[PDB]
Amino acid sequence: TVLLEVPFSARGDRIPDAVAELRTREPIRKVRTITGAEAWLVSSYALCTQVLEDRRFSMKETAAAGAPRLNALTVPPEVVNNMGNIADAGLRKAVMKAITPKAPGLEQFLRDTANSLLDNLITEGAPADLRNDFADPLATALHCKVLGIPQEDGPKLFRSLSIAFMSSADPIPAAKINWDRDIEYMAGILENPNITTGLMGELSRLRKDPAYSHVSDELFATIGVTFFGAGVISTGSFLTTALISLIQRPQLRNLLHEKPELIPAGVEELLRINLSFADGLPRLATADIQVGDVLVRKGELVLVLLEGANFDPEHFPNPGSIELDRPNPTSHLAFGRGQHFCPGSALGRRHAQIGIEALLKKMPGVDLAVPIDQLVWRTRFQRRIPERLPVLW
């Protein structure tokens, strides 16, 4: 027998029975990654929270040369410390303020965009592909608006993502080509006088403010590339798999259609049960640290399995069921926890809430147009997503 390999399954419509067996028997245990490295896979709520809240389990140290790797880097090593670099530049407050869903008109733009996408699918007739022709275009349009960049530039930036978020054993030549091109695009945006709104408009102003005169042009461009990429891949993939979970639950679909004020609670449960992250969150130990029955040694890789935490019955009883009245509804780990908690969490919630509200109003009869087993799940990728999501209504 060989050492247990991760990831277990690229299917995003169901959790393997294996996760519950593992959490019960060995909530921290040694696995092999796709690179051949060994790692500790953590799968209980208690131990996942412990790792994420202890900064001695470091995300920037995962990029060190010679470290055991979950996958190959698709960005320059310094970008693994992206939020640390942003904070060190004095930019964290401005960046986080620009990516909230609170800017005037933003939520209306989201609703208008969702409704337009859905009207076009209704005109064309069933079947419709809710990933490529709804959820991903909605994420792309949102992030162009949030960044302040032209909508027509969205698709080209989007098409970098099927490579940029690969989970590969080896470096990916195309990832560098696309990264360098996207950095050049964002550098041009910062020099473009017509870009005055959104995140890039704000960074463009701060770039010429004496208080930021020593912040590198490379960092400013990197913020644009990285926030577009992480935001689009994360919101598009989450919404897509949330739609499957909703379609699989006609009673829930009808409840949210009938009572749209329950959509936020519904989205929070869809977040909790979401399988969009294809790999555990990686951290490198910077000291010898006890985690359950294992003494993790300095220099070892730890993988925090989000669905391990989020389906843990000790924290979320009847964990496979969507229940809108849980006492601890936001205590899931869908956005991470601790130092690296997702800075786009509010925007991600709103993207999904508006998308779902619009879908349920326009397509109350939405159902899969193919048997669920026919969905094609993307492999060796940092998200779990079906290549196409064919629906009828």
Binding site residues, ligand R2H, CB under 6 A: 59, 74-75, 79-80, 82, 164, 225-226, 229-230
Contacts of 12 (CB under 8 A, 6+ apart): 241, 244, 275, 276, 377, 384, 385, 386
Expressed in angstroms, the distance from the first to the final Cα of the chain is 47
> Which residues, numbered 319-338, are part of the site for ligand HEM (CB under 6 A)?
334-336
Task: Name which of ligand R2H, ligand HEM, none residue 244 binds, using a CB cut-off of 5 to 8 Å depending on partner kind.
Answer: none
Rounded Cα gap, residues 293 and 152, in angstroms: 53
Choose the contact partner of 19 out of ligand R2H, ligand HEM, none; CB within 5 to 8 A by kind: none
Q: Which of 74/204 has CB closer to ligand R2H?
A: 74
Cβ partners under 8 Å of residue 208, min gap 6 = none
SS3 for 54?
Answer: coil
Q: What minimum distance in Å lies between the beta carbon of 204 and ligand R2H?
A: 19
Residue number with CB closer to ligand R2H (230 or 284): 230
Q: What is the DSSP letter of 133?
A: I
335 binds, among ligand R2H, ligand HEM, none (CB under 5 to 8 A by kind): ligand HEM
Which one of residues 22, 34, 79, 99 is an interface residue with ligand HEM (CB under 6 A)?
99
CA distance 9 to 20: 14
Site mask for ligand HEM (CB under 6 A), range 269-308, x = bound:
------------x---------------------------
Q: Taking CB within 5 to 8 Å according to partner kind, which of ligand R2H, ligand HEM, none is near residue 336?
A: ligand HEM
Taking only Cα atoms into account, the Rg of the chain, rounded to an integer number of angstroms, comes to 21
Q: List residues bridging with 366 in a β-sheet.
A: none
**Residue 235 lies near ligand HEM (rule: CB under 6 A):** yes
Is the distance from CB of 282 to CB of 392 less than 8 angstroms? no
238 makes contact with ligand HEM (CB under 6 A): yes
Q: DSSP labels for 171-203? A: --HHHHHHHHHHHHHHHHHHH-TT--SHHHHHH
Based on CB atoms, which residue is closest to ligand R2H, 225 or 389? Answer: 225
382 annotated as belonging to a binding site for a ligand: yes
Q: How far is the C-alpha of 328 from the C-alpha of 77, rounded, in Å?
A: 37
By the rule CB under 6 A, 40 interacts with ligand HEM: no
74 is annotated as contributing to ligand binding: yes
Chain positions contacting ligand HEM, by CB under 6 A? 59, 83, 99, 226-227, 230-231, 234-235, 238, 281, 334-336, 340, 342-344, 347-348
Annotated binding site for heme: 283, 340, 342
